[PDB]
């Protein structure tokens, strides 16, 4: 449901308007041709016009397909890629991989199919495209078209950019609504934070820290920030909409209470990936409880409520007795210097609670004081039942290690150590990261699973930074605004908006 004149709102500016962008955007290959979705598509499209570059894009696609193929179907897919791209007789043969590398992948196959068989090749292909082909693209009409898309991306964002609907959720500093971009029709979840409630409460550094954390991370398993704008009365955060309910509701109201181990395996895998993406920015979550794990329309989960998250300086630790009773690691309850370890304790709490249907230190039918819940977390060893496989008991016992030094995933290796745990032995993380594994529960679409100071003006400028690059470009592609607007001249000629002669 796009606006009536959405083609006028996203109307491409004349290429002459982007000269300032041309001389400020860093010409980074990985950023302009891979990370940024629209730049990626435009660079691919530029390679579509060259017969030599074409075969290199098709191969990377075929390797991406190879990485997610089942194990019993690797050798089949591997031989296909070989006899189509890496055969010197082929029509779409890759010539920029040395003859002493095509030979190696032929041996690798003879040995045994490995899911990274073409990793060496793919890297050589990128080693070639980052050179000449990339610098030719920079002087092509497709990079000028990219500058036009960046220009639109940079445009200011106000309340009139969105269409507010219904108040779906509440909390602290404000409420959570559901908004829609008028020009594209994509649904989001506004997080209206009332300004008066932030000044009176002197928590401006907490709201800015949450926005910066939300924008810096992009993950399929954490709520993403798309826009940050100020409105006269509140400071809004536009986040991923999640309409499938939260994990607490599904554990207890839809559960046994609890899930089958296999079903909990799926959610734990996605949660673990969410934590790994957060930890890549050395950011600790500290708020892992079932009601913060939300489900989307398809049944996948994202981590939500990053208001308790903080960015840990590399090589440093932090203090903070924060979180929810029952979901605080011992090092947090003791108010010690900790790192990312609280999140792996939380992950243990979640896996246990999903399988067993209750918290590892508080029975569902038990009524105990906050103090006794902490004593158990610090002294009592949790007990397991026949709902847990030996592998499930293991990973939970290791993640619930009282000593953060011996806790799983809390070594220099990080989330990788948790992904090898026998509990995930039947989990293909590559296919999960690529969205190829069907969720165990698909929500029904029609479901309802539920003052004039200047220092304030300086705090609003650092917050209301506008649209977020990657989410915005993804919004354009998903809504098919990119497909419809990204048109050129007939027979590969310059369109008017890209011709500097007549503006
Ligand atoms: C559209 C919609 N959006 C949300 C909330 C979210 C969403 O999507 N994505 C995030 C990210 C992050 C948060 C978050 O910070 N939460 C904490 C506590 C918080 C903090 C401060 C506040 F002022 C308020 C809340 C919330 C959300 C919900 C729950 C729904 N509707 C349903 O799920 C639903 C449909 C039918 C039956 O139920």
From Swiss-Prot:
GO terms for biological process: adenylate cyclase-modulating G protein-coupled receptor signaling pathway; apoptotic process; fat cell differentiation; G protein-coupled receptor signaling pathway; negative regulation of apoptotic process; positive regulation of cell population proliferation; protein autophosphorylation; regulation of cell cycle. InterPro entries: AGC-kinase_C, GPCR_kinase, Kinase-like_dom_sf, Prot_kinase_dom, Protein_kinase_ATP_BS, RGS, RGS_sf, RGS_subdomain_2. The active site is at residue 287. Residues 29-147 form the RGS domain. The keyword Nucleotide-binding applies. SMART domains: RGS (SM00315), S_TK_X (SM00133), S_TKc (SM00220). Gene3D superfamilies: 6.10.250.2260, Phosphorylase Kinase, domain 1, Regulator of G-protein Signalling 4, domain 2, Transferase(Phosphotransferase) domain 1. This is G protein-coupled receptor kinase 5. It comes from Homo sapiens.
